[PDB]
Amino acid sequence: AVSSATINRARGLYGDRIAALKDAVAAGDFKAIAEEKNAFILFNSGAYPTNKAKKNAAIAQTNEIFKAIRSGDKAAVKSAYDAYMAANEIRPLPEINSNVGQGYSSEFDFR
Numbered sequence: 001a002v003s004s005a006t007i008n009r010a011r012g013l014y015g016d017r018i019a020a021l022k023d024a025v026a027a028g029d030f031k032a033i034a035e036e037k038n039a040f041i042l043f044n045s046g047a048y049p050t051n052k053a054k055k056n057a058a059i060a061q062t063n064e065i066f067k068a069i070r071s072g073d074k075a076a077v078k079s080a081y082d083a084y085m086a087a088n089e090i091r092p093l094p095e096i097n098s099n100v101g102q103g104y105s106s107e108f109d110f111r
Contacts, residue, residue: 010046
């Protein structure tokens with residue numbers, strides 16, 4: 001049930017769902033983050049099927065994101081989110097469709 005493929009699939013798909021939250025994090029759109037709870041769970045379990053230390057760390061960092069969300073502190077949420085991504089080698093998505101706000105409509109930016 002665990003293989004190099006399952007690890008890559010989880011890291012790719014769920015890591016990308018998490019990276020895609022960049023705009024929501026910037027905007028303080030905490031609902032979007034809460035709507036990706038499963039991406040956090042399945043990244044943490046699928047990327048770390050055997051390494052309990054890394055999984056425990058990832059769960060703690062996830063909890064930190066949600067503690068910050070409950071505080072309503074946008075800066076704290078961004079700090080926790082960035083820390084989680086950096087610690088777990090989840091790379092941000094290419095920021096040249098993050099051409100957001102540079103002359104194109106909001107409909108274009110978020111479609």
